[PDB]
């Protein structure tokens, strides 16, 4: 699919097993993003960086 | 992992194997939970049923 970039004015297309999209953020205040693409498996959340996956394009 | 129900006045702690929290939409037109629990994998988008997913306590 297709999913967006660090800066979301821009997206790529996600190689074969990147079946998801998905957003990094810092904990840190408000979840600012810190980076933002194609996954496989959405990322466990640890006590400072939050993933949060989508499977729409753009979406992320 | 504590994950919020569908009401989500409540959450339930999920087992093993069910890592993360997920939301599930209907996209017919404002974006409406038609589940919420806990889940294995993050499941791929179907054009009317879409899915975020995430790994803090009742983040969904």
Redesign the interface.
């Given at each position: 699919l297709k999913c967006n970039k660090l800066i979301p004015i821009a997206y790529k297309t996600c190689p074969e097993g990147k079946?998801?999209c998905y957003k990094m953020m810092l904990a840190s205040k408000k979840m600012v993003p810190v980076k933002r693409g194609c996954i496989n498996?959405?990322?466990?959340?640890s006590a400072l960086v939050?993933?949060?996956?989508?499977?729409?394009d753009r979406?992320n």
């Open positions: 079946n998801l498996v959405c990322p466990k959340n939050k993933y949060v996956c989508c499977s729409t979406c």
